[PDB]
Amino acid sequence: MPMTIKRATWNNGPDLAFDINNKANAAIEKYGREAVINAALGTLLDDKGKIIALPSVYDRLDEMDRSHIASYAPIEGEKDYRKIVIDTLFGPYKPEGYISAIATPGGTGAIRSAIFSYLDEGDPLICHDYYWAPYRKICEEFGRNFKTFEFFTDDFAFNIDVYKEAIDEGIRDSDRIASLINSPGNNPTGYSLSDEEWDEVITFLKEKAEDKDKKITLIVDVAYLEFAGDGDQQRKFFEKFSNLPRNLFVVVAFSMSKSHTAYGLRSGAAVGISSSKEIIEEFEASLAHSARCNWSNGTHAAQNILIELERAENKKIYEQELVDLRNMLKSRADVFVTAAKENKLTMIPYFGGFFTFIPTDKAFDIVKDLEKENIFTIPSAKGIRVAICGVGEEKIPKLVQRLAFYTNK
Amino acid sequence: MPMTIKRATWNNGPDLAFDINNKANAAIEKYGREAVINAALGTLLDDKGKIIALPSVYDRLDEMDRSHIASYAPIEGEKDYRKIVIDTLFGPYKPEGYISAIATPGGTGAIRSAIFSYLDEGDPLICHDYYWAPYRKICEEFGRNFKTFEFFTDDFAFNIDVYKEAIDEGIRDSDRIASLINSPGNNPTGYSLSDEEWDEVITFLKEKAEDKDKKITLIVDVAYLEFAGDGDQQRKFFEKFSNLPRNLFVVVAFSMSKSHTAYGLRSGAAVGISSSKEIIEEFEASLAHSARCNWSNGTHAAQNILIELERAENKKIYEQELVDLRNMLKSRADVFVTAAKENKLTMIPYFGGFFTFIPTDKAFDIVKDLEKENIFTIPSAKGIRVAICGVGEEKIPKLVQRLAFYTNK
Ligand SMILES: Cc1ncc(COP(=O)(O)O)c(C=O)c1O
Ligand SMILES: Cc1ncc(COP(=O)(O)O)c(C=O)c1O
């Protein structure tokens, strides 16, 4: 006779990714660093396995007034933090409309809030075939309806055809639906929708919004934004959210976790776009309440970091440290993609993000075999996720070789 | 037609504390520090009106390795953080049975989680007449039923009689209920239930728990624990939670916000107490699923701060600093109570907390006059809340005299 309510009763299951990383660390503890290829979890590590913490982020925290760490942030976050999020996130491609950013605990807080506020119980969140688990978990936490569509065509492009069928089905069922896209730099695939795949996406939603009884919410998860190109090309798609119908709402989920190596500081934002002023003020009012009821207010130090980072002398230093980081990951991926070509290993085309993905049918058998050799990766029904963000350049050719051996027999 | 759902739409007006607080700052701007008595918000300020950030707390953050700040915290919180929460919170008074702690974004995190997991939709949260507003807000967010009972008797002791009839009413309309008690150091009143008053409560809920069709959850908000006695006497009541029937669960909402002057770091915990091992594991599973969906994980630096504060050499310094902070606060309450007596001002007996409370029915009218004299406090239907944590000893007499005059004329 459970004490918890049904919606809050969870029949466990082991934390798989938690288990794998435990094994990886144990292996490092037994065999030593260079013997292990630790590619489980999604955190940027230097070639020596140490977690990267950008000096141009943490030098600010060291320098910061005690009071800017101690005091409460406002419910919605610092007035300047809100403004800098919008400036930073969209760069030179801010969409035309009413835009507001409210602070959240990382990107997670933003995603949760969208799903809570813009979907009712029966209503569906339509998501891609390969996805970050918490999306489903959030739906299930709040009794919203998680629903997947096949991500890729046979050629590994956006399966826009099947995307349409799944949206059509959503609108056939509910007068309110939501569509979640995790791009650019999709976890787990590494895929990014092309600027022209985004065109096809937003043109179709505008079509479906014609029926003004329908309300549609697009949730874009951009956590990996700064890791999907030179910082400009991957922001270009934002312009396509300009002047959308009133019943087509966009919520971007911003996070400092990845872009600022500030995972443990839990600082992101939900950013809403609307061609209506009352819709956005309603966005603000709804999430202000949720913030007050769930976390109260964000990590103040982190918001102030982002503010101090927008200062000219600091902005410059951060820009280079980012470019350097951005590059380290990219050439790691370029070794990977080049090796995969040599070793005839089929992989979802890499466009950005912390991971490369190998589609397979024996995903759990293959990790089993690899773990015997001290190579650690994450399996799933779809295939193997490889945390390229954790493995230095030299260990990658071995990784791809042993990966292809087990995947192709 | 709103974009947000019925539950997420908030036709809600002005933020009252916010506004009062802006007014105070604008006044300080116009007339200057000494001319103004800013007794609005619950933050420990020194005699100069500036926030208090305990060196023993923030030195640890200063000396901490970046990796401990930057990296993700485990869902539940660091293994040692969870343990050290339980030890620190209960002191020598740890109740018997199974106990688990789960990191939350401040105390707010712990409270909402309890309300989500242990009340369903029709279900009542029975809370005292004078309450911190977000309790009601959370119920409304999640569709739980907020329900009040008259806190005090005419002599200003816990209204055990009315409390009983309120709980009786819950257990008559629903198979599942919850009691919320913010003690010791109740915001707004400053009241603490005595040990025998707690006895009267647990003994009564034990009687209700005899009906094994009914499930009851006691939520205790102990944010101001360290500011409600000499450290020891105020914790004694925790022993009353030992060996409670399977169907009487207890969630204690712990916070570093006040005790560690760490509000903007957002770090608390939800600590559960049960005689059943599976009730606890069920609790662990539920709050971990909630954490994953709502905030992903806690502010890692803050958890490590608590761990590092546990080192004997790092502990001595912190206690001696907490004693002063606690003693600076109490002697402010002494000056208040001494003045209130001599100015003939009826006030709810103060036992601990950040606020002293003047009961009155003209509270909104009184604070109009008071603001004209640069005296800022928070009005409610019940009276005036004086944030004694904000104002310095030497100003209290004036604040009390002028408070008495408008309350008594
Ligand atoms: C797609 C995606 N969104 C969000 C997050 C996490 O965001 P945050 O740490 O800011 O809560 C991650 C997890 O690493 C992710 O892969
Ligand atoms: C009764 C009570 N509980 C909880 C809190 C806040 O806890 P936290 O800031 O850690 O979320 C406060 C608000 O200041 C409070 O007065």
mmCIF file of C-alpha atoms in Angstrom, chain A residues 1-5 8 10 12 15 43 51 53 55 58-59 61-62 66-67 69-72 105 108-109 112 116-121 132 134 137-138 141-142 144 176 215-217 246-247 249 257-258 261-266 279 282 285-286 289-290 292-301, chain B residues 1-6 8 10 43 51 53 55 58-59 61-62 66-67 69-72 75 105 108-109 112 116-121 132 134 137-138 141-142 144 176 215-217 246-247 249 257-258 261-266 279 282 285-286 289-290 292-301:
data_model
loop_
_atom_site.group_PDB
_atom_site.id
_atom_site.type_symbol
_atom_site.label_atom_id
_atom_site.label_comp_id
_atom_site.label_asym_id
_atom_site.label_seq_id
_atom_site.Cartn_x
_atom_site.Cartn_y
_atom_site.Cartn_z
ATOM 1 C CA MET A 1 0.000 0.000 0.000
ATOM 2 C CA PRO A 2 2.169 2.875 -1.295
ATOM 3 C CA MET A 3 2.332 6.186 0.606
ATOM 4 C CA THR A 4 3.138 8.070 -2.603
ATOM 5 C CA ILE A 5 0.396 8.883 -5.118
ATOM 6 C CA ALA A 8 4.731 9.717 -8.005
ATOM 7 C CA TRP A 10 8.215 4.732 -9.667
ATOM 8 C CA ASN A 12 12.885 1.771 -10.120
ATOM 9 C CA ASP A 15 20.340 3.974 -13.502
ATOM 10 C CA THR A 43 30.862 16.314 -19.769
ATOM 11 C CA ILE A 51 36.763 18.170 -16.318
ATOM 12 C CA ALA A 53 36.178 24.587 -16.126
ATOM 13 C CA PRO A 55 38.931 30.207 -16.232
ATOM 14 C CA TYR A 58 35.286 30.962 -12.798
ATOM 15 C CA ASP A 59 37.661 33.943 -12.523
ATOM 16 C CA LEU A 61 33.098 33.839 -9.411
ATOM 17 C CA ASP A 62 36.405 34.286 -7.512
ATOM 18 C CA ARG A 66 30.117 37.795 -1.541
ATOM 19 C CA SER A 67 26.682 39.452 -1.634
ATOM 20 C CA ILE A 69 26.470 34.919 -4.317
ATOM 21 C CA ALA A 70 24.629 35.024 -0.984
ATOM 22 C CA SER A 71 21.508 37.109 -1.756
ATOM 23 C CA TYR A 72 18.352 35.824 -3.451
ATOM 24 C CA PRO A 105 17.592 25.573 -13.007
ATOM 25 C CA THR A 108 15.992 21.133 -17.581
ATOM 26 C CA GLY A 109 13.978 23.775 -15.719
ATOM 27 C CA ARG A 112 9.898 21.069 -17.670
ATOM 28 C CA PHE A 116 3.836 21.939 -17.824
ATOM 29 C CA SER A 117 2.383 25.250 -18.996
ATOM 30 C CA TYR A 118 1.578 24.586 -22.664
ATOM 31 C CA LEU A 119 0.241 21.038 -22.464
ATOM 32 C CA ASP A 120 -2.669 19.681 -20.471
ATOM 33 C CA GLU A 121 -3.066 16.089 -19.256
ATOM 34 C CA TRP A 132 17.198 12.674 -24.011
ATOM 35 C CA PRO A 134 14.041 13.210 -19.138
ATOM 36 C CA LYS A 137 10.145 11.289 -17.707
ATOM 37 C CA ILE A 138 8.746 14.829 -17.410
ATOM 38 C CA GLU A 141 5.732 13.023 -14.043
ATOM 39 C CA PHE A 142 2.967 15.434 -15.110
ATOM 40 C CA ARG A 144 1.375 14.591 -20.356
ATOM 41 C CA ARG A 176 -3.463 21.504 -28.089
ATOM 42 C CA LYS A 215 -2.788 25.730 -30.249
ATOM 43 C CA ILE A 216 0.764 24.591 -30.998
ATOM 44 C CA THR A 217 3.924 24.942 -28.905
ATOM 45 C CA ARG A 246 -0.463 33.793 -32.432
ATOM 46 C CA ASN A 247 -1.393 30.142 -31.843
ATOM 47 C CA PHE A 249 4.363 29.564 -29.614
ATOM 48 C CA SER A 257 25.645 23.973 -18.426
ATOM 49 C CA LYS A 258 27.479 23.225 -21.680
ATOM 50 C CA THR A 261 31.079 24.712 -18.330
ATOM 51 C CA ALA A 262 28.699 25.464 -15.437
ATOM 52 C CA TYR A 263 26.775 22.193 -15.100
ATOM 53 C CA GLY A 264 26.857 22.167 -11.274
ATOM 54 C CA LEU A 265 25.630 25.777 -11.069
ATOM 55 C CA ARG A 266 22.194 24.941 -12.511
ATOM 56 C CA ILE A 279 0.691 35.963 -24.990
ATOM 57 C CA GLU A 282 1.009 35.474 -19.949
ATOM 58 C CA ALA A 285 3.104 35.328 -15.432
ATOM 59 C CA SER A 286 2.823 31.547 -15.779
ATOM 60 C CA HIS A 289 4.468 31.292 -10.619
ATOM 61 C CA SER A 290 6.079 27.967 -11.455
ATOM 62 C CA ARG A 292 8.121 30.418 -7.214
ATOM 63 C CA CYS A 293 6.558 26.998 -6.585
ATOM 64 C CA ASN A 294 9.291 24.641 -7.726
ATOM 65 C CA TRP A 295 12.761 26.115 -7.091
ATOM 66 C CA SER A 296 11.858 29.575 -5.765
ATOM 67 C CA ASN A 297 14.629 31.441 -7.633
ATOM 68 C CA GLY A 298 17.785 30.586 -9.588
ATOM 69 C CA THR A 299 21.469 30.328 -8.665
ATOM 70 C CA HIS A 300 22.324 33.994 -8.212
ATOM 71 C CA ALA A 301 26.103 33.684 -8.688
ATOM 72 C CA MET B 1 -8.098 32.498 -25.727
ATOM 73 C CA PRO B 2 -4.931 31.922 -23.649
ATOM 74 C CA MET B 3 -1.885 29.953 -24.849
ATOM 75 C CA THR B 4 -1.327 28.618 -21.323
ATOM 76 C CA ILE B 5 -3.527 25.921 -19.747
ATOM 77 C CA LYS B 6 -6.210 26.704 -17.100
ATOM 78 C CA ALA B 8 -0.932 27.632 -15.725
ATOM 79 C CA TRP B 10 -2.482 33.442 -13.590
ATOM 80 C CA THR B 43 17.454 38.339 4.936
ATOM 81 C CA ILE B 51 23.695 41.279 3.803
ATOM 82 C CA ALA B 53 27.670 36.232 4.245
ATOM 83 C CA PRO B 55 33.093 33.824 6.128
ATOM 84 C CA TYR B 58 32.083 31.385 1.732
ATOM 85 C CA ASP B 59 35.774 30.709 2.487
ATOM 86 C CA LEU B 61 33.720 28.085 -1.799
ATOM 87 C CA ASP B 62 36.790 30.316 -2.233
ATOM 88 C CA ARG B 66 36.780 24.277 -9.575
ATOM 89 C CA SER B 67 35.927 20.661 -10.439
ATOM 90 C CA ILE B 69 31.850 23.629 -8.367
ATOM 91 C CA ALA B 70 31.637 22.818 -12.109
ATOM 92 C CA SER B 71 30.597 19.117 -12.149
ATOM 93 C CA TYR B 72 27.044 17.747 -11.917
ATOM 94 C CA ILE B 75 20.365 13.316 -8.639
ATOM 95 C CA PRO B 105 16.700 23.588 -4.617
ATOM 96 C CA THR B 108 11.181 25.293 -1.415
ATOM 97 C CA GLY B 109 12.362 22.227 -3.352
ATOM 98 C CA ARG B 112 6.737 21.134 -3.268
ATOM 99 C CA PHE B 116 3.340 16.578 -5.098
ATOM 100 C CA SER B 117 4.184 13.039 -3.958
ATOM 101 C CA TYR B 118 1.885 12.664 -0.926
ATOM 102 C CA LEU B 119 -1.237 14.545 -1.972
ATOM 103 C CA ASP B 120 -3.263 13.877 -5.080
ATOM 104 C CA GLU B 121 -5.780 16.297 -6.673
ATOM 105 C CA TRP B 132 4.309 31.597 4.099
ATOM 106 C CA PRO B 134 4.128 29.743 -1.383
ATOM 107 C CA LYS B 137 0.704 28.705 -4.295
ATOM 108 C CA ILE B 138 2.105 25.156 -4.699
ATOM 109 C CA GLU B 141 -0.094 24.935 -9.107
ATOM 110 C CA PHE B 142 -0.529 21.183 -8.594
ATOM 111 C CA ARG B 144 -3.942 20.121 -4.269
ATOM 112 C CA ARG B 176 -5.227 10.881 1.960
ATOM 113 C CA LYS B 215 -2.725 7.901 4.773
ATOM 114 C CA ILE B 216 -1.298 10.958 6.520
ATOM 115 C CA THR B 217 1.817 13.015 5.783
ATOM 116 C CA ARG B 246 3.481 2.765 8.625
ATOM 117 C CA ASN B 247 0.714 5.100 7.352
ATOM 118 C CA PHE B 249 4.899 9.532 7.038
ATOM 119 C CA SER B 257 19.402 29.305 3.025
ATOM 120 C CA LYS B 258 19.287 30.796 6.535
ATOM 121 C CA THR B 261 23.523 32.453 4.836
ATOM 122 C CA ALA B 262 23.316 30.705 1.461
ATOM 123 C CA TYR B 263 19.990 31.822 -0.061
ATOM 124 C CA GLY B 264 21.292 32.466 -3.595
ATOM 125 C CA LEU B 265 23.035 29.102 -3.651
ATOM 126 C CA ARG B 266 19.676 27.259 -3.543
ATOM 127 C CA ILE B 279 8.195 3.420 2.384
ATOM 128 C CA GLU B 282 9.561 4.498 -2.374
ATOM 129 C CA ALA B 285 12.623 6.720 -5.882
ATOM 130 C CA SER B 286 9.863 9.319 -6.089
ATOM 131 C CA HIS B 289 12.270 11.055 -10.314
ATOM 132 C CA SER B 290 10.903 14.446 -9.338
ATOM 133 C CA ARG B 292 15.253 14.575 -12.546
ATOM 134 C CA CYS B 293 12.182 16.155 -14.046
ATOM 135 C CA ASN B 294 12.141 19.478 -12.228
ATOM 136 C CA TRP B 295 15.751 20.647 -11.622
ATOM 137 C CA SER B 296 17.963 17.719 -12.698
ATOM 138 C CA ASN B 297 20.368 18.160 -9.751
ATOM 139 C CA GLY B 298 21.417 20.491 -6.934
ATOM 140 C CA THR B 299 23.907 23.332 -6.797
ATOM 141 C CA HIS B 300 27.019 21.205 -6.495
ATOM 142 C CA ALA B 301 29.233 23.820 -4.802
#
